[PDB]
């Protein structure tokens, strides 16, 4: 039986992160996407455990080969980063459930390059639940503040172009959610 291959997204700051030590916790054998990157490994990390380092040019041949589901420039072009292809395949022949963790322009660029994948969304309980995380301790500027309403409001808006959608009211209920969908 092949793998459930589910690709995890929402809002910027919606509590994403979480959510995804939950499930990792509670699925031993979950398959965590590990993304291609072209920048430098920091001190500690593992190479094909934090990321796949791979060098500039070699990534624009896996690009020209149709071997990323999604990429994207780092810091302006920095760098960059993506969702190689094969092992998330490899992982669901082998039976395994994968988790792919992307912001909403990763999640639509992988929906063509994967259409089984599973697209999720992670929505807050309500606009006002994530209004007062956006204003947390209000440490920003008003502009800054504004802008972030506004990507809120844009980025809610898109939830329909997704295949499920998982209200985040409860740690464990969501969490409880996404279990159902990788696991069968």
């Given at each position: 039986a092949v793998g459930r291959v589910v690709v995890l997204s929402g809002p910027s700051a919606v509590g994403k992160s979480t959510v995804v030590r939950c499930l990792?916790?509670?699925?031993?054998?979950?398959?965590?996407s590990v993304s291609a990157t072209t920048r430098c490994p920091?001190?500690?990390?593992?190479d094909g455990v934090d990321y796949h380092f791979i060098d500039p040019t070699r990534f624009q041949q896996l690009i020209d080969?149709?071997?990323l589901l999604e990429w994207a420039e780092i810091h302006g072009g920095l760098?960059?980063?993506?969702?190689?292809?094969?092992p998330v395949r490899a992982a669901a022949a082998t039976g395994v459930p994968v988790l792919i963790e992307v912001d909403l322009a990763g999640a639509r660029a992988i929906k063509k390059t994967?259409?089984?994948?599973?697209?999720?969304?992670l929505a807050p309980?309500?606009?006002?639940d994530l209004q007062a995380r956006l204003i947390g301790r209000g440490c920003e500027t008003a502009d800054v503040i504004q802008r972030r309403l506004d990507t809120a409001r844009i980025e809610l808006a898109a939830q329909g172009d997704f295949?499920?959608?998982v209200v985040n009211r409860?740690?464990?209920?969501?969490c409880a959610e996404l279990v159902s969908l990788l696991v069968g």
């Open positions: 990792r916790e509670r699925i031993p054998n979950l398959h965590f920091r001190p500690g990390e593992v080969q149709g071997e760098h960059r980063s993506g969702t190689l292809a094969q994967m259409p089984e994948a599973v697209t999720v969304f309980p309500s606009w006002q295949d499920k959608v409860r740690l464990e209920s969501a």
